[PDB]
Amino acid sequence: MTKYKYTVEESERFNKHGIDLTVYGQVDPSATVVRVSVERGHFQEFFNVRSSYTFYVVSGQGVFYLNSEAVPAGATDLITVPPNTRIHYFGSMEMVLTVAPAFNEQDERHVRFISESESPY
Ligand SMILES: O=c1ccn([C@@H]2O[C@H](CO)[C@@H](O)[C@H]2O)c(=O)[nH]1
């Protein structure tokens, strides 16, 4: 009766500002978990007024810019970002991302675009 398991095959996969997102389709008010694949960066800076962003780095290396502060990241690191924190990032990475409470695009605010030449990856 209840669906517990979601697959990549049945997910929604799309590119957003340079990252490849896998949105599984599960609904849970407390958290959204998605996959992120990034080749060079997320070339837009935004913040979320309601939800924290927690990135687990499966593989690769990158750098997060959190309120303009560089935060290096490598495989097996956990990057935790509170609400109301400006976020962009560069890197070649595979990640698991938790947005808590559940992701709602209406909670996010655009700050600026980032030139693709700014990524050192
Ligand atoms: O469920 C989610 C989680 C994150 N993002 C996007 O992922 C990027 C940050 O990794 C941002 O563009 C953010 O809006 C989504 O589109 N949906």
How would you write the chain as a 3-class SS string?
CCCCCCCCCCCEEEEECCEEEEECCCCCCCCEEEEEEECCEEEEEEEECCCEEEEEEEEEEEEEEECCEEEEEECCCEEEECCCCCEEEEEEEEEEEEEECCCCHHHEEEEEECCHHHCCC
CA separation for the pair 66, 71 (Å, rounded): 7
Structure solved via: X-ray
How many whole angstroms separate alpha carbon 119 and alpha carbon 115? 8
What amino acid occupies position 121?
Y
Q: Where are the domains of the chain?
A: 1-121
114 touches 46 (CB < 8 A): no
98, 31 Cβ separation under 8 angstroms:
yes
Please give the Cα distance from 49 to 7 (Å, whole number).
29
Q: Are 14 and 21 in contact (CB under 8 A)?
A: yes
Q: How far does residue 2's CA lie from ligand 1's centre (Å)?
A: 26
* Among the listed residues 29, 20, 28, 24, the one whose alpha carbon sits nearest the alpha carbon of residue 6: 24
φ, ψ of residue 105 to 5 degrees: the values are: -55, -30
Q: For this experimental structure, what is the resolution in angstroms?
A: 1.6
**Best probe residue, ligand 1, of 97, 104, 113 (max atoms within 8 Å of C-beta):** 97
Nearest CA-CA partner of 48 in 114, 111, 113, 112? 111
49, 98, 103, 104, best to mutate for ligand 1 pocket (most atoms within 8 Å of CB)? 103
